[PDB]
Design a binder for this molecule. Structure first.
Ligand SMILES: [Zn+2]
Ligand SMILES: [Zn+2]
Ligand SMILES: [Zn+2]
Length: 178
């Protein structure tokens, strides 16, 4: 196994996947690494299994259909993985914890949002459809763009949104377009 966490790239108390060489901090993995379970398979492995069991799950889909899907176990897993892929980028630090807004010439968002809140929401089964999760993810970046206006820091929102959107299209097998 790797000697660093796959998500944050640090050493520490790591839990090792039994079916691949990745390792994780307990609360870096999503869901948090399970108490018992020998062998244990990480989220990467669990997502690969879904694909292998249903190869046709990789044919192209329309985003509108994906969003309306109910959060059954497989869609719950896919959203957990997509959230984890965002955390894997170091620029996610900016969006992880609860933000506050006090900048001359701007007003804070009406509905603040952040990664750890989405994380808790998934853990608590608060989303009934994929759309719920995706709307909250996109709101994080949209809030950021609006608040920071012409400051160059706005680009951090663009950057992390692009990681989200690429991973969304991959994980949910969105039909490729120009
Ligand atoms: Zn970690
Ligand atoms: Zn694994
Ligand atoms: Zn099948």
């Amino acid at each position: 196994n790797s000697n660093i966490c796959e998500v944050c790239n640090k050493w520490g108390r790591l839990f090792c996947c039994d079916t691949c060489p990745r390792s994780f901090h307990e609360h870096c993995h999503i869901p948090s690494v399970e108490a018992n379970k020998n062998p244990w398979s990480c989220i990467f492995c669990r997502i690969k299994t879904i694909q292998e069991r249903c190869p046709e799950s990789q044919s192209g889909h329309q985003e509108s259909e994906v969003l309306m899907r109910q959060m059954l176990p497989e869609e719950q897993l896919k959203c957990e993985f997509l959230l984890l892929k965002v955390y894997c980028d170091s620029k996610s630090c900016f969006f992880a914890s609860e933000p506050y807004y006090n900048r001359e010439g701007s007003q804070g968002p009406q509905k603040p949002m952040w990664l750890n809140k989405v994380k808790t929401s998934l853990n608590e089964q608060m989303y009934t459809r994929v759309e719920g999760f995706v709307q909250d993810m996109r709101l994080i970046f949209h809030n950021h763009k609006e608040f920071y206006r012409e400051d160059k820091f706005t680009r951090l929102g663009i950057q992390v949104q692009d990681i989200f959107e690429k991973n969304f299209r991959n994980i949910f097998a969105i039909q490729e377009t120009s």
